[PDB]
Amino acid sequence: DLSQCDREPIHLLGGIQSHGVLLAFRGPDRLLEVVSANAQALLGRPPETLLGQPVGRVLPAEVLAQWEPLVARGSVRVVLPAGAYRALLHESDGLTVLELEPAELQPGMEETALEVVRRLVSPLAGVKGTQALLQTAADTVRALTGFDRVMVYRFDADWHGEVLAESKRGGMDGFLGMHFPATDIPVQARALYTRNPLRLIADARARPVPLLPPVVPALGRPLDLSNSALRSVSPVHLEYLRNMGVGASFSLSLLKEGVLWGLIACHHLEPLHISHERRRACEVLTQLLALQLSAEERAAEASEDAHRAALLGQLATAMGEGGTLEEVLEKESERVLALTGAAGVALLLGEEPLLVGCTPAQDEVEALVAWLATQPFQTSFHTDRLGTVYPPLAARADVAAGILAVRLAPAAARFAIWFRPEVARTISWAGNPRKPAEPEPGHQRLHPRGSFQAWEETVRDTSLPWKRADLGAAEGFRGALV
Amino acid sequence: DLSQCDREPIHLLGGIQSHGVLLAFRGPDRLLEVVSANAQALLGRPPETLLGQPVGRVLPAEVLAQWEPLVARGSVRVVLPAGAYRALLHESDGLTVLELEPAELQPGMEETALEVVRRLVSPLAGVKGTQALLQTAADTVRALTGFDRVMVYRFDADWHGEVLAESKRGGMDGFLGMHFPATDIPVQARALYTRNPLRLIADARARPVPLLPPVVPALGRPLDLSNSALRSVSPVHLEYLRNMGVGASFSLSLLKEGVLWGLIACHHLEPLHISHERRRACEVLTQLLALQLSAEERAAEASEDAHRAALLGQLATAMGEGGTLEEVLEKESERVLALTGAAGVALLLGEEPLLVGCTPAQDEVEALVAWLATQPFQTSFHTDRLGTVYPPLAARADVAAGILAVRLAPAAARFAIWFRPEVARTISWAGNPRKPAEPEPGHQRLHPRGSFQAWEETVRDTSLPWKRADLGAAEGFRGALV
Ligand SMILES: C/C=C1/C(Cc2[nH]c(Cc3[nH]c(CC4=NC(=O)C(CC)=C4C)c(C)c3CCC(=O)O)c(CCC(=O)O)c2C)=NC(=O)[C@H]1C
Ligand SMILES: C/C=C1/C(Cc2[nH]c(Cc3[nH]c(CC4=NC(=O)C(CC)=C4C)c(C)c3CCC(=O)O)c(CCC(=O)O)c2C)=NC(=O)[C@H]1C
Question: Domain named Phytochrome chromophore attachment site: which ranges (chains A, B) (predicted)?
Fold first, then answer.
């Protein structure tokens, strides 16, 4: 449901954060076309007096002197009388956009950032699970930014999320283990954060600084700030932060193999500015974690296939040793079950269903057998909640919350079906997920929820999900039965 | 081992390079027990007069001021009248070993290294090959060090190596594409390079600085310099370098999943010193490259499996279709051959052999079968030079240089044998591989070979090697079974 939440154009809000200045120029003269309203504190003259002026008569010599590596490199450090600033350049709406924000002051920041990069490559990290890998990545981002709380947030397939790992101060609330509704990060935010993988909110309490004029005159809408480092965020998100009692927020996108896997979210209790250069140090760490995860996930998957493949191998040996099919599938039953991590399996070699291990009754299997043949899968069907899709067995969550069926034949209904029971899980939501926002009367003004306290839910009638190795092994068991 | 090359104890040569100073202290009084003979170059006083003195009365006050940071984190920067020095600390033979070496002088070194870490950790690292990945790794190690020539050197299974990639300055002799004898890096050097992954030879023409006394008086042999950053290398190697025309050399071990995969080898035409901290920066790059290679390689492997599994899946559908075995094997010829990347296949199903694709003659298959029937393999057998193990077919490298046989049976002779033709290869060696060293008469004193000029050989009678995916596909084709 395209929520109110999803429709907010958060790149077109017309404001920037007060700790920096934004300037936009167009054309060969580089005429000032847009400028933030706080520009006087760095430019000297009041902003309105500088609209339409050539860049050489609006910027101080220190900035103009760096224009070429600014254009080439996209960012440079400059010393203004007001202090050290980072200048960032990008293009947007056919304007040249220049942002200035206080520069990194710690001389050894990069030296410290190289140390934490070493912790995250190491010999082999993640030796005691991917859980150790996430925790280490949380600890390093926290050690490098100084934030009170750093959390590793993973998106589930429904785009709801859970905090898998956490690194925070002593005497500090936490959210380790909790789940958050998908609307906490609406769809347009996720699309932006897929392209722009960093965002700092340096002071959740502060008021945004408007742009001058409020629309780009050629366009009739505000300047697109998709790529702006100073962009002020959705006001409903600030209210969300304030409802958490956090004063500053900084999060980096975790793109793994091109997809938005999750976020590293940082919270501070007080306002706090992280330099551009320090933000990029952290961006190196998150691309490093993403690499380590792909490398360990692909090894976990290879090891898993190796286990299943050896099961098929022992089955093959067992077949060619005594023309006793129903007999070997009886003596070798737990290998047949282990193939897909299952607890029962019906075999439709034709006559009567051969029922091995823990299964539903002969009547009930022949009843979903007949139902299965008339479905739009070609070789294999699988679900982890049979009952929501075939209610004749909704009451049998104890043996068939999940099934995995391969078709052993072109036409005709020759099947091998693996069964799984339900596995109850208690997920703990940060706030009541039935009430993920508070609309005003009239439903034109949304507010974040006011509470984040643990609200517990138990999931029934769904099995362990069928993993890729399971499917692979089933496909190969199908190859072994003509 | 075999060579006199393997005998040389390169950790007990008792010399350091002239650009640093080594001190070793024993016991609670930190008494000076070993010292390099150049020690006066930084210590003011003759070394011999300092043996047996407490650390408090031998080290300059600048160093002593940093004793506790040094002892704590094991590495520190100290400013001496001679200039800025990195102090490094380790333990060996129950001594505390203190090494001094010129410190890094570029203040933005770490910032510079974080930029090249970005280049190498970027997602989109692979998107023109694992080849493009090595090239980038050479280019960035070269950017960060300044060496004339950087090469990526991979060890083959017999521990000879070849240069896979190369970043060099304009107008430099290359080595890209050449092969080097295994004895070029003998057995005990590979061992030491597996636990000590960095080494710098700052001036190939310099004489080493001896240690005083020439033995550790407790042990009766020289101090162990395994972990010494200043260790002077084997004289046979310094000679190898000079014959190669190089004045400085620096190499890093490429350790992949525990094993010594290869080296990044750097050559400089002049003498040149890299600071310790800049050496540790490059080490971050090599561990990064190792990470990227494991992930890409494991991706390639998974993709191969998937293609193979699709072939098995398409085969199984052709079964349980119409006809008999040999019927569907007739249509599915190309699939059965592609399962293992093969040019022919023989099927011993009990009758006469069934010969598909490009096979040797029937009588020859039956000879090969009767011989395979005795061999000591469990389910699978493979080789890539059949003729060396079975000379009846040694003439037939046009259809049968490589074979992969699986046993479709137990104590029976039922096989599927896949055949591969030879693939001729032109190895280019750096110098004549038949004379990889020039010994003096009597064979006491050895010397590197004199020339590294390209020297070609062509490898006949060897098929392309059998990969894991071929093996897996064969095991799974054996899934069939009468
Ligand atoms: C109706 C819309 C809603 C929104 C909307 C929302 N929520 C967000 C952003 C958001 N929401 C969240 C959610 C979030 N922060 C956390 O720490 C956790 C768990 C621990 C979560 C789920 C994050 C991390 C962000 C990125 C900004 C940041 O790092 O602080 C946006 C885009 C902000 C912008 O870029 O302008 C928008 C439009 N949140 C709600 O709870 C509801 C009421
Ligand atoms: C009989 C002994 C021999 C040796 C012995 C040898 N050769 C080596 C070292 C060696 N040999 C090589 C070989 C080598 N350098 C290159 O550039 C290339 C190809 C491009 C190669 C094969 C390397 C990279 C190293 C590591 C030191 C360095 O980066 O320069 C040792 C150990 C050195 C030490 O750490 O003490 C030893 C004992 N080389 C030969 O050609 C023969 C003659």
Answer: 129-287
